[PDB]
Paper text:
FcμR is the IgM antibody isotype-specific Fc receptor involved in the survival and activation of B cells. In this study, we image a complex of the ectodomain of human FcμR and the IgM-Fc pentameric core using single-particle cryogenic electron microscopy (cryo-EM). The analysis reveals multiple binding sites for the N-terminal Ig domain of FcμR on the Cμ4 domain dimers within the IgM constant region and provides a framework for understanding FcμR’s role in immunoglobulin recognition and signalling. A key common feature of the FcμR binding sites is that only the Cμ4 domains are involved in the interactions.
We resolved only the Ig domain of FcμR with the remaining ectodomain density appearing disordered at locations distal to the IgM binding site. Fig. 1a-b demonstrates the overall architecture of the multivalent engagement of the IgM pentamer by FcμR molecules. Each FcμR is similarly positioned relative to the IgM subunit. An IgM pentamer has ten potential FcμR binding sites, but only eight are found to be occupied.The two FcμR-absent positions are the front of subunit Fcμ5 (position 5f) and the back of subunit Fcμ1 (position 1b) though extremely low occupancy at position 5f may be suggested by features near the noise level in unsharpened cryo-EM maps. The tip of the hairpin-1 region in the J chain may prevent the addition of an FcμR at position 5f by marginally blocking FcμR at Ser55-Thr57. Position 1b seems available for binding, but access to this site may be blocked by the hairpin-2 region in the J chain, a highly flexible loop containing 30 residues that remains unstructured in the cryo-EM map. The eight binding sites on IgM pentamer are not equally occupied by FcμR. The highest FcμR occupancies are at positions 1f and 3f (nearly 90%), followed by 2b-4b and 4f (40-60%), and with 2f and 5b the lowest (around 10%). The low occupancy at position 2f, which is sandwiched between the two most heavily occupied FcμR binding sites, may indicate a subtle steric hindrance between adjacent FcμR molecules. Multivalent engagement of IgM facilitates the capture of soluble IgM or IgM immune complexes by FcμR anchored on cell surfaces, leading to FcμR clustering and signalling.
Numbering used by the authors:
A (entry chain J): 3 to 68, 98 to 134
B (entry chain A): 346 to 576
C (entry chain I): 19 to 124
D (entry chain L): 449 to 576
E (entry chain B): 461 to 571
F (entry chain C): 461 to 569
G (entry chain R), H (entry chain S), I (entry chain O): 20 to 124
């Protein structure tokens, strides 16, 4: 019944809508609008860099939804580079920040 | 005593150049000693020069290295290391065979912050890093602070040990110790690990004061133009 | 939402359960979610695991060709009833993909 | 020479209180030089020309070179229980895609309630 | 908490540090009843880098996630030849690292 | 609570109940250092009224409120002759059972 | 999990059969009040006998068949509900086996 | 993001430098009213010059260096605030560049 | 409210003058620690002399002038702050009079 206006996965906002029938009449058919955001309190500021401070402020301009990101995507891989000094050989190596989703 | 150390995955993975070493110790000092390498079919491979100097306590300390193909090692071909000394006319033969690979599995990495009671003492804080359930045993672990690697002597790493709950599984520990002031200055520490199963061969977890079991949840939820124009 | 396939037993002795097999995921579980809290407790899963109660009567066979995985449970009792789920990923709750119901007429 | 801006409006709230009919208005402004006409299609099927009544291009109140036009259409009141969305369209030479289909439905419009349900968790990182 | 999301098992770790000399003894029990010795593993005393001659050790125990959630407490006991009573205990449960307080601040607007 | 609104002292009690036989040993230590036996008192094994063939004791410790508001785990060790290894201990601090507190600050507009 | 669904008659006595586990000292036959989600212990190894059941119930343990039997003498309408039996310091967390009781008169 | 922090004198004229983007037809030099979180368009390619700025401002676009220049003739105390310039149909969503203005007299 | 701003010298002794009220039995000379909004009782009629001040202070009450006098023998840098005196069980909700102390050496 409910149509979907927004399915953003970066902000996990699901804007939907539905019109409910009145008490056996075509009048006062009140419309609805459901919004469901799921805030992550453990994610960092720069989601692709595990050194930036924690994410405190959350700004949601609903107009844009219907680029800084807040949450990860179950269908994608995030990677980075770290210096491994193994054998006295400082070496930048790629690292799967979000493993199990890079297979 | 004749000691043989096979090359580690991390060495072959990072340094790329790979070699296997046989060393002798607890042996009377005697020059003119030959170090050789033998496969299962009898073929000999080139042994490298630049033998290590003897130990100051009047005993041997030598290095012998050779290069064998990584695909050859993956083929599971048995190799033998031999050394010659006049004291023991019969050369000592030892095996450095690589047993291919048993079922591969990814290592779950959990990193935990210091205990609350420990911080009450306001002396020093210890951060741990519990790798878990990796088969086989080949995990290289290291620590860096805010993008700068730390000395290997500032932390201690365990060795793979069997897992009672999971047959054919191994786990390991690692702890780092720092002063309380450093932990209380939002400094950030991470525990990078390296294993064959890892898709990128390297993965990392990170914690700080704010993320390790925090006391308060400061939040600034703010939304605007809720009505807007949505289609 | 995803399908709500339902199965029955017609007296105990054997039962068979099938769920869709997702791609690019290594974990597969059949948690029962039969708890007052609601937190699903994984019964039989890959990555090596099993249920203290459900042992020797539970097995998993993944078939990538049919995009399905198969779990076979021998016999039947009063405890192993109610509902069951299926899914993937590394979060038993929030990672489900079906809601199957198990019942026996005995 | 500017892009012809277009808009659409739904029937009035007080209009849906006599139970006779309803009107939907598609406003076309700009399109310099004045070259537009509107065809009101529903479900991809054009409606009869006798229903929609386009009149003429008219200069904007302050018109350096701009113009505008208005076109309405008449429907039945009892048919709005399902909407059908009664699409509008415009055509002009100063358009990269020469079509700007515009359509609205009972569902589209002013929200009469805002059921926000935000949640806080420490496991939303993946946002499954 | 990351391990808990799997709804399979849980690992409590007991960390003994600073003692000298070696030969410490660690055992696990709940509600005063000793636990089976085939469910936990203990490391041997290992030298401490900065410390001149002090050692450390660590033991881990695996329990069902359900059991942790049920609310059961698990106590860890160490026996060394230097403690005045030669015995010590600690205790952890679900109510250990709960956030002490929330400070949310919604500022809903339409402009 | 009303004891602490005095700024002079506080008393911590260590109730022991349901043991048999008598001769239980209780002493108070702070962060691993046993405290002087003069700083605390102790009751004597007296019978449990509703529970027959049983005993219970008591022990209190006086302490300044200045230092109680800073930490000092203050564990209470008990030495009976029927424990699994003859010794047990418990501890409480200023934040033993503080619950969760919400501070919602809606700026609804 | 298992339910004895034990049945009896008004007056006389009825025996409740519950499993006797090992590595668990306190054994109780809690009554599921099911009021505010709280269960009140009827009898325990701590010699805790409820006042309403004082002098009418007993608990005998004998690890022969890993079973402990509890007998309820006399019977009243009040004695017609759920008496989950279990072990552990927290009564509510235990109560492994569930049973039901009624009156036939 | 970038701030020209352009400066000028009372009277005369001052030129505001803002980036001219591609795939965006409407180009505006909105004034950040910062009253109830609303920005009012001063000028646009759609042809709208605010009444207070009528006959004193102009907007010329030339994709030579990907720049469009806006000139403000005359000057008043009122002309001493923020004029975020941007593109797109929505005005309070663009504001690609922020700038500040003042008066020296 | 009133401040004696009493002054003294290192060593010797200094007398603190504070009002002796009626219908209030507990009389104290609290020291305003002003650390975490807390005041620690230095002396009281209930008999509590802080350890740091043990054997160096005394409190004598006489109804002759609704005044009670407290003497501090010896002196240390530590003895150079605020000693609000008051009555009642709650020490932080009394502090009838505020006073300051210092050292001259
Ligand atoms: C967030 O982190 C990313 C990654 O470090 C930053 O972008 C990288 O910047 C470096 C140079 O500083 C480049 O080598 C990388 O190629 C960039 N990453 C990508 C994906 O292009 C980014 O700038 C950071 N954001 C902030 C605000 O600091
Ligand atoms: C908590 O948030 C406020 C703003 O809402 C900020 O002023 C304060 O610094 C934050 N607390 C910490 C510890 O950063
Ligand atoms: C309001 O939102 C809640 C949460 O999504 C939902 O359960 C409820 O049905 C909604 N009410 C209406 C009238 O849509
Ligand atoms: C608590 O929230 C208020 C309101 O945002 C803020 O002013 C204050 O700084 C916050 N406290 C902390 C410790 O973050
Ligand atoms: C509680 O909320 C009030 C009002 O926003 C704020 O002033 C205060 O700092 C908050 N306390 C904490 C500990 O955040």
């Amino acid at each position: 019944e409910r149509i979907v206006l927004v399915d953003n996965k970066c902000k996990c906002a699901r804007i939907t809508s539905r019109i409910i029938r009145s008490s056996e009449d075509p009048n006062e058919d009140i419309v609805e609008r459901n919004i469901r955001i799921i805030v992550p309190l453990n994610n960092r500021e720069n989601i692709s860099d595990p050194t930036s401070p924690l994410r405190t402020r959350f700004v949601y301009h609903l107009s844009d939804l219907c680029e800084t990101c807040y949450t990860y995507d179950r269908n994608k891989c995030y990677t980075a580079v770290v210096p491994l000094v193994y054998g006295g050989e400082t070496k930048m190596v790629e690292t799967a920040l979000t493993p199990d989703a890079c297979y | 005593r004749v000691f043989a150390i096979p090359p580690s995955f991390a060495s072959i993975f990072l340094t790329k150049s790979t070699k296997l070493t046989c060393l002798v110790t607890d042996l009377t000092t005697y020059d003119s000693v030959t170090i050789s390498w033998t496969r299962q079919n009898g073929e000999a491979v080139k042994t490298h020069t630049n033998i290590s100097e003897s130990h100051p306590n009047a005993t041997f300390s030598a290095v012998g290295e050779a290069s064998i193909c990584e695909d050859d090692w993956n083929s599971g071909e048995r190799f033998t290391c031999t050394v010659t000394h006049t004291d023991l006319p019969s050369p000592l033969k030892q095996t450095i065979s690589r047993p291919k690979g048993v079922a591969l599995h990814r290592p779950d990495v959990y990193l935990l912050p210091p205990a609350r009671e420990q911080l009450n003492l306001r002396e020093s804080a210890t951060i741990t890093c519990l790798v878990t359930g990796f088969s086989p045993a080949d995990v290289f672990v290291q620590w860096m602070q805010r993008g700068q690697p730390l000395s290997p002597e500032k932390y201690v790493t365990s060795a793979p040990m069997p897992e009672p709950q999971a047959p054919g599984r191994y786990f390991a520990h690692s702890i780092l110790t720092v002063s309380e002031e450093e932990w209380n200055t939002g400094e950030t520490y991470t525990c990078v690990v390296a294993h064959e199963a890892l898709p990128n061969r390297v993965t990392e977890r990170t914690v700080d004061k704010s993320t390790g079991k925090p006391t308060l949840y400061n939040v600034s939820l703010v939304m605007s133009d809720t009505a807007g124009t949505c289609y | 939402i995803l399908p709500e396939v339902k199965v029955e037993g017609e007296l105990g002795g054997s039962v068979t359960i099938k769920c869709p097999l997702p791609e690019m995921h290594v974990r597969i579980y059949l948690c029962r979610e039969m708890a007052g809290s609601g937190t699903c407790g994984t019964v039989v899963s890959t990555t090596n695991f099993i249920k203290a109660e459900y042992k020797g009567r539970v097995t998993l066979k993944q078939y990538p060709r049919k995009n399905l995985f198969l779990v076979e449970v021998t016999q039947l009792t009063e405890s192993d009833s109610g509902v069951y789920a299926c899914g993937a990923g590394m979060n038993t709750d929030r990672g489900k993909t079906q809601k199957v119901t198990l019942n026996v007429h005995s």
